[PDB]
Amino acid sequence: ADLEDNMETLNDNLKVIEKADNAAQVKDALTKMKAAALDAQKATPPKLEDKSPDSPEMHDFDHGFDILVGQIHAALHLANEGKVKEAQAAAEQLKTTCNACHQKYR
Amino acid sequence: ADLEDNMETLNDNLKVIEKADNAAQVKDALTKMKAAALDAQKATPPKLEDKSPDSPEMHDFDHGFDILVGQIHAALHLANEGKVKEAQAAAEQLKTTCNACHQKYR
Amino acid sequence: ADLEDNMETLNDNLKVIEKADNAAQVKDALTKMKAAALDAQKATPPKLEDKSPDSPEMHDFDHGFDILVGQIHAALHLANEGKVKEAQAAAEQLKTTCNACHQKYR
Amino acid sequence: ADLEDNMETLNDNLKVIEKADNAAQVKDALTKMKAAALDAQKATPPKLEDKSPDSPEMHDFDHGFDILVGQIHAALHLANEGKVKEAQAAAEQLKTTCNACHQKYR
Ligand code: HEM
Ligand code: HEM
Ligand code: HEM
Ligand code: HEM
Ligand SMILES: [Ca+2]
Ligand SMILES: [Ca+2]
Ligand SMILES: [Ca+2]
Ligand SMILES: [Ca+2]
Ligand SMILES: [Ca+2]
Ligand SMILES: [Zn+2]
Ligand SMILES: [Zn+2]
Ligand SMILES: [Zn+2]
Ligand SMILES: [Zn+2]
């Protein structure tokens, strides 16, 4: 999928997590977010189209996804332990990573 | 230092971060928590004293600290960007990692 | 792409890197291996098809890819520095990771 | 300990790994290398004391240690599997990380 498609999947699933009632629903949404994040990672965003692949900016862009994926990983552990409210809180808190990257590269 | 001492350091700095007025205070506190987590990471907790250093339990224990350290790292980005409330919120959220490891190994 | 196809992509590029004489070739090859490794993570291998998504086996399987991805990342740093032979050795190095997962989950 | 002494621990143990005759000796030295690398992470090199802990340089310096620690973790897995020759080759290979950082910040 292209970058924007994966971003939509990321955004859609955050909403699903916010309104979910049980752990299974949260786990499923988080799993989809992980796949979308990883798929997004191979993209070169418009704002960095003219930068070299080895540029500090592309390295930072990639690092942003690593941070996100890590937060998704931790959230999954919480969901897997049936801690719905905590997993939901983790999904909400990681919005700060979405924001940080957007400020720099969206 | 002893596992328990690093744990005391982690607990106290969560309080320092909560009471912080500014970004500098939160950064310093996160930095201290990082040191404590990495030092605590080489210890053998009492409940796993009978386990081989190479065991699923000790690998998971080690992984738990990696999760915590990754959260401190993300929180540090927020504080370094002057986002005091966000960094404070990130510190609050990572309490779930503290709790998750305790439930299994404390 | 599916698990098997991403694997063939990993194998083909490892061979490309081995025959490479310039950094551009190595960079391109690792780039493709990174995309393939990440794409493969969304897959559930046949051997773990009937194990819970949160099983220790699935967490270990995921860990294997993280180790692989990290090795690719380290190799890319060397490739981007024009250190061809160093990058090639890093690529050869990680075959041990390929083998480890295969013995356990293939 | 300080940055300098932890670096000594890293250097000495690499020699121990090269001279090692069994898996346990290698695992033991790698374990000491991990502790030293992590403990080392809490330091600001002389050449970066002028840079903010928030600069791209300080972040890159920090990242370097994470790369090294990841390579140590992967080497541990090999040593734990009794693959002495392989673990020795991993140790030899991670020397590129040692050099890559030194070139920039030593
Ligand atoms: C879960 C967190 C995230 C959410 C919910 C999210 C959501 C979105 C949405 C709704 C869009 C606009 C979609 C469109 O233009 O069609 C977008 C765009 C974008 N996102 Fe994110 N995003 C997240 C994390 C990230 C991260 C971590 C990075 C960087 C490492 C990033 C980089 C981008 C870029 C570069 C664009 C612009 C794409 C374009 O206009 O071509 N995003 N994101
Ligand atoms: C910021 C998060 C954390 C906080 C605030 C925290 C706080 C504490 C505190 C106050 C204690 C009691 C110490 C004592 O009574 O002497 C403790 C014990 C312990 N913590 Fe944590 N901890 C955190 C994260 C972790 C993590 C991530 C792990 C595991 C990966 C962990 C493992 C333990 C263990 C095993 C003990 C018991 C030590 C013993 O009884 O000897 N902690 N922690
Ligand atoms: C660069 C390292 C790797 C290379 C070169 C590689 C290569 C391959 C190749 C060529 C195949 C298909 C062989 C056949 O047709 O029978 C394969 C299958 C497989 N690999 Fe890997 N692999 C690597 C790493 C990994 C890792 C790290 C894991 C696990 C974490 C893994 C899990 C699997 C599994 C589960 C299969 C079987 C898929 C199926 O039959 O449906 N591989 N790999
Ligand atoms: C296992 C790999 C490594 C080995 C064997 C190693 C070894 C050493 C040695 C022997 C020294 C000289 C100590 C002295 O002055 O007495 C040194 C210095 C230093 N190392 Fe490493 N090192 C390694 C990895 C790293 C990495 C990954 C970084 C960067 C992230 C790094 C950064 C430094 C710096 C900045 C110094 C200068 C210290 C000073 O000026 O006091 N080293 N290293
Ligand atoms: Ca759009
Ligand atoms: Ca104690
Ligand atoms: Ca106190
Ligand atoms: Ca201070
Ligand atoms: Ca095929
Ligand atoms: Zn995990
Ligand atoms: Zn960072
Ligand atoms: Zn890097
Ligand atoms: Zn491991």
Side-chain angles (χ1 to χ4, degrees), chain A residues 38-88:
Chain A
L38 294 190
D39 198 54
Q41 224 173 321
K42 75 196 176 190
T44 297
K47 268 49 172 50
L48 299 181
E49 281 176 356
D50 299 331
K51 290 289 188 184
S52 62
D54 68 329
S55 65
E57 293 85 352
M58 283 299 264
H59 186 273
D60 184 47
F61 183 70
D62 179 70
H63 177 49
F65 282 115
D66 284 342
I67 293 172
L68 177 64
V69 172
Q71 288 168 142
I72 297 173
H73 185 80
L76 284 161
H77 274 287
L78 299 182
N80 286 156
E81 303 295 355
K83 294 159 186 177
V84 184
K85 294 191 177 175
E86 292 186 6
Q88 291 178 301

Short mmCIF file of all heavy atoms in Angstrom, two decimals, chain A residues 38-88:
data_model
loop_
_atom_site.label_atom_id
_atom_site.label_comp_id
_atom_site.label_asym_id
_atom_site.label_seq_id
_atom_site.Cartn_x
_atom_site.Cartn_y
_atom_site.Cartn_z
N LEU A 38 4.65 -0.82 9.45
CA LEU A 38 5.77 -1.47 8.78
C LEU A 38 5.72 -1.26 7.27
O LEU A 38 6.76 -1.08 6.63
CB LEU A 38 5.79 -2.97 9.10
CG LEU A 38 6.07 -3.28 10.58
CD1 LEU A 38 6.32 -4.78 10.75
CD2 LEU A 38 7.29 -2.47 11.06
N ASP A 39 4.52 -1.27 6.69
CA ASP A 39 4.41 -1.07 5.25
C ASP A 39 4.73 0.39 4.90
O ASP A 39 5.31 0.67 3.85
CB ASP A 39 3.00 -1.43 4.77
CG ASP A 39 2.94 -1.67 3.27
OD1 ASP A 39 3.72 -2.52 2.77
OD2 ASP A 39 2.10 -1.04 2.60
N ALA A 40 4.36 1.31 5.78
CA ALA A 40 4.61 2.73 5.56
C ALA A 40 6.11 3.03 5.56
O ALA A 40 6.59 3.92 4.84
CB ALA A 40 3.93 3.55 6.66
N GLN A 41 6.85 2.25 6.36
CA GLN A 41 8.29 2.43 6.51
C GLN A 41 9.13 2.39 5.24
O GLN A 41 10.22 2.95 5.22
CB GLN A 41 8.81 1.41 7.53
CG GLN A 41 9.79 1.98 8.51
CD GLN A 41 10.16 1.00 9.60
OE1 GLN A 41 9.31 0.26 10.10
NE2 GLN A 41 11.42 1.01 10.00
N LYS A 42 8.64 1.74 4.19
CA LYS A 42 9.41 1.66 2.94
C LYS A 42 9.20 2.87 2.03
O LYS A 42 9.84 3.00 0.99
CB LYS A 42 9.02 0.39 2.16
CG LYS A 42 7.66 0.48 1.47
CD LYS A 42 7.14 -0.88 1.05
CE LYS A 42 5.75 -0.77 0.45
NZ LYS A 42 5.13 -2.11 0.24
N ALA A 43 8.30 3.77 2.43
CA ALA A 43 7.99 4.92 1.62
C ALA A 43 8.90 6.11 1.78
O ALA A 43 9.53 6.30 2.83
CB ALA A 43 6.55 5.36 1.88
N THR A 44 8.96 6.92 0.73
CA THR A 44 9.71 8.16 0.75
C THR A 44 8.59 9.20 0.73
O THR A 44 7.87 9.33 -0.27
CB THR A 44 10.60 8.35 -0.49
OG1 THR A 44 11.58 7.31 -0.55
CG2 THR A 44 11.31 9.70 -0.43
N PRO A 45 8.39 9.94 1.84
CA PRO A 45 7.34 10.96 1.93
C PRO A 45 7.64 12.14 1.00
O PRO A 45 8.80 12.49 0.80
CB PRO A 45 7.38 11.36 3.40
CG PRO A 45 8.85 11.24 3.72
CD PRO A 45 9.26 9.96 3.03
N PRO A 46 6.59 12.76 0.44
CA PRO A 46 6.71 13.91 -0.48
C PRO A 46 7.76 14.93 -0.04
O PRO A 46 8.61 15.35 -0.83
CB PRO A 46 5.31 14.51 -0.45
CG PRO A 46 4.45 13.33 -0.28
CD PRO A 46 5.18 12.51 0.76
N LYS A 47 7.69 15.31 1.23
CA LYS A 47 8.60 16.30 1.79
C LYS A 47 10.07 15.89 1.76
O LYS A 47 10.95 16.74 1.83
CB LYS A 47 8.19 16.63 3.23
CG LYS A 47 7.24 17.82 3.40
CD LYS A 47 6.03 17.77 2.47
CE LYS A 47 5.02 18.87 2.80
NZ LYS A 47 5.62 20.21 2.93
N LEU A 48 10.35 14.59 1.67
CA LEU A 48 11.73 14.14 1.62
C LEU A 48 12.11 13.56 0.26
O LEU A 48 13.18 12.97 0.11
CB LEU A 48 11.97 13.09 2.72
CG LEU A 48 11.76 13.57 4.16
CD1 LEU A 48 12.07 12.45 5.15
CD2 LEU A 48 12.64 14.79 4.41
N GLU A 49 11.23 13.74 -0.73
CA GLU A 49 11.46 13.22 -2.09
C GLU A 49 12.78 13.62 -2.74
O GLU A 49 13.36 12.85 -3.53
CB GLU A 49 10.32 13.66 -3.03
CG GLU A 49 9.03 12.86 -2.90
CD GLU A 49 7.92 13.40 -3.79
OE1 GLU A 49 8.13 14.46 -4.44
OE2 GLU A 49 6.83 12.79 -3.83
N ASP A 50 13.25 14.82 -2.42
CA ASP A 50 14.48 15.33 -3.00
C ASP A 50 15.71 15.10 -2.14
O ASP A 50 16.81 15.51 -2.52
CB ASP A 50 14.32 16.83 -3.30
CG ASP A 50 13.21 17.10 -4.29
OD1 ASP A 50 12.95 16.21 -5.13
OD2 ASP A 50 12.60 18.18 -4.23
N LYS A 51 15.53 14.45 -1.00
CA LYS A 51 16.67 14.17 -0.12
C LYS A 51 17.28 12.83 -0.51
O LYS A 51 16.60 11.97 -1.08
CB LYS A 51 16.21 14.12 1.35
CG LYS A 51 15.81 15.47 1.94
CD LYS A 51 17.03 16.34 2.16
CE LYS A 51 16.69 17.60 2.93
NZ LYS A 51 17.88 18.49 3.05
N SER A 52 18.56 12.64 -0.22
CA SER A 52 19.20 11.37 -0.54
C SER A 52 18.71 10.28 0.40
O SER A 52 18.34 10.54 1.55
CB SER A 52 20.72 11.47 -0.45
OG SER A 52 21.15 11.77 0.86
N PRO A 53 18.68 9.03 -0.08
CA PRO A 53 18.23 7.92 0.76
C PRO A 53 19.00 7.81 2.08
O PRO A 53 18.43 7.43 3.10
CB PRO A 53 18.44 6.71 -0.15
CG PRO A 53 18.10 7.26 -1.50
CD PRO A 53 18.85 8.59 -1.48
N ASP A 54 20.28 8.15 2.06
CA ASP A 54 21.09 8.04 3.28
C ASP A 54 21.11 9.31 4.11
O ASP A 54 21.86 9.42 5.08
CB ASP A 54 22.52 7.64 2.91
CG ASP A 54 23.26 8.73 2.16
OD1 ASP A 54 22.60 9.49 1.42
OD2 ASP A 54 24.50 8.82 2.31
N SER A 55 20.27 10.27 3.75
CA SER A 55 20.19 11.54 4.47
C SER A 55 19.76 11.36 5.92
O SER A 55 19.05 10.42 6.25
CB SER A 55 19.18 12.45 3.78
OG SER A 55 17.87 11.89 3.86
N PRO A 56 20.19 12.28 6.81
CA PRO A 56 19.82 12.22 8.23
C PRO A 56 18.29 12.26 8.38
O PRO A 56 17.73 11.65 9.28
CB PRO A 56 20.48 13.47 8.80
CG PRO A 56 21.73 13.59 7.98
CD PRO A 56 21.24 13.29 6.58
N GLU A 57 17.62 13.00 7.49
CA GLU A 57 16.17 13.10 7.53
C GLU A 57 15.47 11.75 7.29
O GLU A 57 14.48 11.43 7.96
CB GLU A 57 15.66 14.10 6.48
CG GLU A 57 16.03 15.57 6.74
CD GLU A 57 17.41 15.96 6.22
OE1 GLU A 57 18.17 15.08 5.79
OE2 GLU A 57 17.73 17.16 6.23
N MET A 58 15.95 10.98 6.33
CA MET A 58 15.33 9.68 6.06
C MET A 58 15.61 8.73 7.22
O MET A 58 14.78 7.88 7.55
CB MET A 58 15.86 9.08 4.75
CG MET A 58 15.26 9.70 3.48
SD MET A 58 13.47 9.45 3.42
CE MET A 58 13.34 7.98 2.39
N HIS A 59 16.77 8.88 7.84
CA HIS A 59 17.11 8.01 8.97
C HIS A 59 16.18 8.35 10.13
O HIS A 59 15.70 7.46 10.83
CB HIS A 59 18.58 8.19 9.38
CG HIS A 59 19.03 7.23 10.44
ND1 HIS A 59 18.89 7.49 11.79
CD2 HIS A 59 19.60 6.01 10.34
CE1 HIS A 59 19.35 6.46 12.48
NE2 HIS A 59 19.79 5.55 11.63
N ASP A 60 15.91 9.64 10.31
CA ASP A 60 15.03 10.12 11.38
C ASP A 60 13.58 9.72 11.13
O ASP A 60 12.85 9.39 12.06
CB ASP A 60 15.12 11.64 11.50
CG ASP A 60 14.30 12.18 12.66
OD1 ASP A 60 14.40 11.62 13.77
OD2 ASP A 60 13.56 13.17 12.47
N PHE A 61 13.18 9.78 9.87
CA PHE A 61 11.83 9.40 9.45
C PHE A 61 11.63 7.93 9.85
O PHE A 61 10.65 7.59 10.51
CB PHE A 61 11.72 9.58 7.94
CG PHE A 61 10.34 9.30 7.38
CD1 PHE A 61 9.29 10.16 7.64
CD2 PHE A 61 10.13 8.20 6.56
CE1 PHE A 61 8.03 9.95 7.07
CE2 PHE A 61 8.88 7.98 5.99
CZ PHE A 61 7.83 8.85 6.24
N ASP A 62 12.57 7.08 9.45
CA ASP A 62 12.51 5.65 9.77
C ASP A 62 12.47 5.39 11.29
O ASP A 62 11.72 4.54 11.78
CB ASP A 62 13.72 4.96 9.14
CG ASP A 62 13.77 3.48 9.45
OD1 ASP A 62 12.92 2.74 8.91
OD2 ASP A 62 14.66 3.05 10.22
N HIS A 63 13.27 6.15 12.03
CA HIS A 63 13.35 6.03 13.49
C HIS A 63 11.98 6.31 14.08
O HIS A 63 11.58 5.68 15.05
CB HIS A 63 14.40 7.03 14.02
CG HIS A 63 14.52 7.06 15.51
ND1 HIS A 63 14.66 5.92 16.27
CD2 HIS A 63 14.59 8.11 16.37
CE1 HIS A 63 14.81 6.26 17.54
NE2 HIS A 63 14.77 7.58 17.63
N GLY A 64 11.26 7.25 13.47
CA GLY A 64 9.92 7.59 13.94
C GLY A 64 9.00 6.38 13.86
O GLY A 64 8.18 6.16 14.76
N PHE A 65 9.11 5.60 12.79
CA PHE A 65 8.29 4.41 12.66
C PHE A 65 8.71 3.38 13.70
O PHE A 65 7.85 2.75 14.31
CB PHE A 65 8.36 3.84 11.24
CG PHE A 65 7.51 4.59 10.26
CD1 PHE A 65 8.09 5.27 9.20
CD2 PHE A 65 6.13 4.63 10.42
CE1 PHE A 65 7.29 5.98 8.31
CE2 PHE A 65 5.33 5.34 9.52
CZ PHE A 65 5.92 6.02 8.47
N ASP A 66 10.01 3.23 13.91
CA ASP A 66 10.49 2.29 14.92
C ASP A 66 9.90 2.62 16.28
O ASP A 66 9.51 1.72 17.05
CB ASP A 66 12.02 2.32 15.01
CG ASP A 66 12.69 1.59 13.87
OD1 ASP A 66 12.00 0.79 13.20
OD2 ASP A 66 13.90 1.81 13.65
N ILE A 67 9.85 3.92 16.60
CA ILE A 67 9.27 4.36 17.87
C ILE A 67 7.79 3.95 17.92
O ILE A 67 7.32 3.40 18.91
CB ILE A 67 9.39 5.89 18.05
CG1 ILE A 67 10.88 6.27 18.21
CG2 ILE A 67 8.56 6.34 19.25
CD1 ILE A 67 11.16 7.79 18.20
N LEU A 68 7.07 4.22 16.84
CA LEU A 68 5.65 3.87 16.77
C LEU A 68 5.42 2.38 16.93
O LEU A 68 4.54 1.96 17.69
CB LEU A 68 5.08 4.30 15.42
CG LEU A 68 3.61 3.95 15.16
CD1 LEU A 68 2.74 4.68 16.15
CD2 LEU A 68 3.25 4.35 13.74
N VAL A 69 6.20 1.59 16.19
CA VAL A 69 6.04 0.15 16.22
C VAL A 69 6.29 -0.38 17.61
O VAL A 69 5.59 -1.27 18.10
CB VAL A 69 6.98 -0.52 15.18
CG1 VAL A 69 6.96 -2.03 15.35
CG2 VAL A 69 6.47 -0.19 13.77
N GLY A 70 7.27 0.22 18.28
CA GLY A 70 7.58 -0.18 19.63
C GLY A 70 6.42 0.12 20.56
O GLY A 70 6.12 -0.66 21.46
N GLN A 71 5.76 1.25 20.36
CA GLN A 71 4.62 1.59 21.21
C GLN A 71 3.47 0.63 20.92
O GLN A 71 2.73 0.24 21.83
CB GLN A 71 4.22 3.04 20.96
CG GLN A 71 5.25 4.01 21.55
CD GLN A 71 5.07 5.45 21.09
OE1 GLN A 71 5.26 6.39 21.87
NE2 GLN A 71 4.72 5.64 19.82
N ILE A 72 3.34 0.22 19.66
CA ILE A 72 2.28 -0.72 19.29
C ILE A 72 2.60 -2.07 19.95
O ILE A 72 1.71 -2.75 20.45
CB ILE A 72 2.19 -0.88 17.75
CG1 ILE A 72 1.79 0.46 17.12
CG2 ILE A 72 1.13 -1.93 17.39
CD1 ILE A 72 1.84 0.46 15.57
N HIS A 73 3.87 -2.43 19.98
CA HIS A 73 4.30 -3.70 20.57
C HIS A 73 3.91 -3.74 22.05
O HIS A 73 3.33 -4.71 22.54
CB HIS A 73 5.83 -3.87 20.45
CG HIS A 73 6.33 -5.20 20.93
ND1 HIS A 73 6.26 -6.34 20.16
CD2 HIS A 73 6.89 -5.57 22.10
CE1 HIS A 73 6.75 -7.36 20.84
NE2 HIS A 73 7.14 -6.92 22.02
N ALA A 74 4.25 -2.67 22.76
CA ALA A 74 3.95 -2.59 24.19
C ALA A 74 2.45 -2.62 24.40
O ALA A 74 1.96 -3.26 25.32
CB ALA A 74 4.55 -1.29 24.79
N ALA A 75 1.71 -1.92 23.54
CA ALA A 75 0.25 -1.88 23.67
C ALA A 75 -0.33 -3.29 23.50
O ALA A 75 -1.27 -3.68 24.21
CB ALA A 75 -0.34 -0.95 22.65
N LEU A 76 0.24 -4.05 22.57
CA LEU A 76 -0.22 -5.43 22.35
C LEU A 76 -0.01 -6.28 23.59
O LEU A 76 -0.86 -7.11 23.93
CB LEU A 76 0.52 -6.04 21.15
CG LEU A 76 0.02 -5.56 19.79
CD1 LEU A 76 1.06 -5.83 18.70
CD2 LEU A 76 -1.30 -6.27 19.48
N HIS A 77 1.12 -6.11 24.29
CA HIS A 77 1.35 -6.88 25.50
C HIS A 77 0.21 -6.60 26.48
O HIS A 77 -0.32 -7.52 27.10
CB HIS A 77 2.69 -6.52 26.17
CG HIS A 77 3.88 -7.28 25.64
ND1 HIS A 77 4.09 -8.62 25.92
CD2 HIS A 77 4.93 -6.89 24.88
CE1 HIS A 77 5.22 -9.01 25.36
NE2 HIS A 77 5.75 -7.97 24.72
N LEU A 78 -0.17 -5.32 26.61
CA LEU A 78 -1.23 -4.95 27.53
C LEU A 78 -2.55 -5.60 27.12
O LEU A 78 -3.25 -6.17 27.96
CB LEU A 78 -1.39 -3.43 27.59
CG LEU A 78 -0.18 -2.60 28.07
CD1 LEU A 78 -0.57 -1.13 28.09
CD2 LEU A 78 0.25 -3.04 29.46
N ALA A 79 -2.89 -5.49 25.83
CA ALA A 79 -4.12 -6.08 25.30
C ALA A 79 -4.10 -7.59 25.50
O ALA A 79 -5.11 -8.18 25.88
CB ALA A 79 -4.27 -5.74 23.82
N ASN A 80 -2.96 -8.21 25.24
CA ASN A 80 -2.83 -9.66 25.40
C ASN A 80 -3.03 -10.09 26.85
O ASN A 80 -3.36 -11.25 27.12
CB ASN A 80 -1.45 -10.12 24.89
CG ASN A 80 -1.35 -10.12 23.38
OD1 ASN A 80 -0.26 -10.03 22.82
ND2 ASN A 80 -2.49 -10.24 22.71
N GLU A 81 -2.84 -9.17 27.79
CA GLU A 81 -3.04 -9.52 29.19
C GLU A 81 -4.46 -9.13 29.61
O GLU A 81 -4.78 -9.13 30.79
CB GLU A 81 -2.02 -8.82 30.10
CG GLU A 81 -0.56 -9.10 29.75
CD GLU A 81 -0.15 -10.55 29.95
OE1 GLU A 81 -0.98 -11.35 30.46
OE2 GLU A 81 1.00 -10.91 29.59
N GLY A 82 -5.28 -8.76 28.63
CA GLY A 82 -6.66 -8.38 28.91
C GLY A 82 -6.86 -7.00 29.52
O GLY A 82 -7.95 -6.67 29.98
N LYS A 83 -5.80 -6.20 29.54
CA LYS A 83 -5.87 -4.85 30.10
C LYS A 83 -6.37 -3.89 29.02
O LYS A 83 -5.61 -3.09 28.47
CB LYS A 83 -4.49 -4.44 30.58
CG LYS A 83 -3.99 -5.26 31.76
CD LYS A 83 -2.49 -5.18 31.88
CE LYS A 83 -1.97 -6.11 32.97
NZ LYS A 83 -0.48 -6.07 33.04
N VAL A 84 -7.67 -3.97 28.74
CA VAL A 84 -8.31 -3.13 27.73
C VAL A 84 -8.12 -1.64 27.94
O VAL A 84 -7.63 -0.95 27.05
CB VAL A 84 -9.82 -3.41 27.65
CG1 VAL A 84 -10.44 -2.58 26.52
CG2 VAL A 84 -10.05 -4.88 27.42
N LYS A 85 -8.49 -1.15 29.12
CA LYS A 85 -8.36 0.28 29.39
C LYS A 85 -6.92 0.72 29.25
O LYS A 85 -6.66 1.78 28.69
CB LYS A 85 -8.87 0.61 30.81
CG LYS A 85 -10.36 0.39 31.01
CD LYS A 85 -10.85 1.01 32.33
CE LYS A 85 -12.36 0.85 32.49
NZ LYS A 85 -12.86 1.33 33.82
N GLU A 86 -5.98 -0.09 29.72
CA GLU A 86 -4.57 0.29 29.60
C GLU A 86 -4.10 0.27 28.15
O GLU A 86 -3.34 1.14 27.74
CB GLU A 86 -3.69 -0.63 30.45
CG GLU A 86 -3.89 -0.46 31.94
CD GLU A 86 -2.90 -1.28 32.75
OE1 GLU A 86 -1.98 -1.87 32.14
OE2 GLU A 86 -3.03 -1.32 33.99
N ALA A 87 -4.56 -0.70 27.37
CA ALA A 87 -4.15 -0.75 25.97
C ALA A 87 -4.74 0.44 25.24
O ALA A 87 -4.11 1.02 24.35
CB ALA A 87 -4.60 -2.04 25.31
N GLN A 88 -5.97 0.81 25.60
CA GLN A 88 -6.59 1.94 24.95
C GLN A 88 -5.82 3.21 25.27
O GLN A 88 -5.63 4.08 24.42
CB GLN A 88 -8.05 2.06 25.40
CG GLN A 88 -8.91 0.91 24.87
CD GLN A 88 -10.34 0.99 25.36
OE1 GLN A 88 -10.58 0.99 26.56
NE2 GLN A 88 -11.29 1.05 24.43
#
